[PDB]
């Protein structure tokens, strides 16, 4: 069994796949803390988890001339000033299950918890590349490609890329992270080194990093080429053409209700509605609207968070709103978020439906009853 | 009459205000050309148009130490390398009239044409500020404030600001423009000098520029403070608090149908649907979906445009789709656009309603009949 060496996990996780391991925290714990504890942080693995001996580990970085820089874990820790970045990772397939209700889709059936937040610590990717000898700026459209130590039966490693400009930008905060919430990277989260790409879909934050290569082209890996792309609702498997859509990098504005849960019976008087909101590209959440009547009338929620510099809001906003609720009524609780570019979420999931269940950001709706 | 000196305009414009002058091109000409001719480019004036004598004109630029740099038009032309940028300007109030159909709103009742595109030419704002002596980077959150030569009865000039980082960024393409579509700036469009801020709401592109000042604060002008801000649909004039919402800078993804027009009767056989799509922040339009049945089923439109570098898609995409249409049927033609961060447009206008009629980006719907 290729998975026998996989690490043990917290028992309260909502697992949608055991082998490879894919799981989200319970929604009732998801937004309980601003920083998601390491044991609860959602896990998305395509493959078996690498078993890495710390001392013999080497990160490979190709130089401008095609030579190779080889970095140990100790060197990565000591040569580069540690930078700490609080960033939310959200999977492209977050809230996929909601799309399946329109029409069955391909992919892991995530509920609202394919998203978590951590304080990451590591070397700036910028500094590692400048140390390798690369300039601040390359002419034309270049990419930094990453390969993981995890590989399929045939030997093809997990791979993804980001634009070179994001990799080199001080403000973009791209890390080669060896620390997560103040402790070393857990195995499930990329021990000993992962890329963290703030404001960008989880897919690009390559775990168990073995190689960094600068290329005039995007990662040729099938996960970069044939996955994590958004198509029109008319597109089906007979007509899909991966060349017609860009690889997801930045994600659009997103929010979900974490409290209460669908189908719950709540006591009369007062109810505290809670959830999360986030947007990609370092765009801050500037408002969250909350409705109890299916989106007919709205109230403005209270936002909790780090006030980050403009364009660098990498972490989610947690939100809450206390409302009066009357015994014997039915409520449909809805939330929608607005970001710093005033992007908004769409009303319904059908018009954003797609065959791969990606980019599920229509308003989250939670129907509950108020008991007598 | 304070407006007696205003310039004459093209007679086919859809004027919503004569004094001050505010008008959009007819929708049937709006997307006819990629570059909107100067005579048709939508015009938004708060005040009378300044009469500027070219030779005595001086642009005032405050230095880091509080001194003043004074630049003539000839100096602006000769001292700084001319840069050309093709950029779409869209007013915050574009498509405001559609919001009024939910509930009356305050503001000029724009239809879909408070948007136009031009090739702008001028000095980079970056170069002008570096020449004034400013560094590449100031610590903290700084702003570049602009004042126009147009002033209200009391003497308060039109004013707006942008973040300092955008002003200094080579990639952001902020111009002090003295040329528009290859000719000098028309009076209605800011003669002799306007700011053009690509990817950002029209409000910040200050016309008839008299002063550029670097400040630790946003523009204190009432147009920056008490206007062009997006609020929750629950907010009314008794409860509005301008401190609770950010000044609009980047705009969200937008699209409209320009052909055919609402209420038209079209011949059977084939119909070519056309329109525009655009998104702020240099985010490219990556797809436009078009429906004929009120948004139940969709087809992918053809996109026409400049393929710009990533993050620098300042110009709109024009789009078209040819479909079969059957005699004696009714169609509701709908378009929605998707940008490079996969932001999308929302289904309906009610949930994005606001008291000032801002940020109207719900799907544009055009009902027509197919004749026999
Ligand atoms: N090497 C490697 N890196 C990877 C993956 C993987 O399978 N292998 N999964 C990616 C995807 S699709 C997501 S959503 C995130 C999930 O990160 P987490 O498990 O730390 O939440 O890791 C990304 N990095
Ligand atoms: N000086 C000055 N600049 C200004 C304005 C103004 O009234 N005065 N209007 C602003 C607004 S709200 C918009 S939408 C754009 C419109 O530019 P246009 O008239 O060239 O289309 O100009 C901006 N710049
Ligand atoms: Mo993912
Ligand atoms: Mo405007």
Curated annotation (Swiss-Prot), chains A, B:
Free-text comment on the cofactor: Binds 1 heme b (iron(II)-protoporphyrin IX) group non-covalently per subunit. Binds 1 Mo-molybdopterin (Mo-MPT) cofactor per subunit.
Give all cystine bridges in this chain: none
Ordered alphabetically, the record's keywords are: Heme, Iron, Metal-binding, Mitochondrion, Molybdenum, Oxidoreductase
Annotated residues for binding of Mo-molybdopterin: 42-46, 91, 150, 189, 194, 205-207
Location in the cell reads:
Mitochondrion intermembrane space
Catalytic activity field: sulfite + O2 + H2O = sulfate + H2O2
Spans annotated as Moco domain: 2-229
**Pathway(s) this gene product operates in, as recorded in its UniProt entry:** Energy metabolism; sulfur metabolism
Task: Give the UniProt entry's GO cellular component terms.
Answer: mitochondrial intermembrane space; mitochondrion
Q: What is its EC number?
A: 1.8.3.1
- Which cofactor is essential here? heme b; Mo-molybdopterin
What molecular function does GO assign, one term? Answer: molybdenum ion binding
Annotated spans, Disordered:
1-21
Single GO BP term: sulfur compound metabolic process
Ranges for region Homodimerization: 230-365
Main subcellular location of this protein, as a coarse class: mitochondrion
Q: Give the quaternary structure.
A: Homodimer.
Physiological role: Catalyzes the oxidation of sulfite to sulfate, the terminal reaction in the oxidative degradation of sulfur-containing amino acids.
Query: Could you identify this protein by its name?
Result: Sulfite oxidase
This chain's source organism reads Gallus gallus (Chicken)
Which taxonomic lineage does the organism of this UniProt entry have?
Eukaryota, Metazoa, Chordata, Craniata, Vertebrata
Part of the full-length chain shown: 95 to 459 of 459
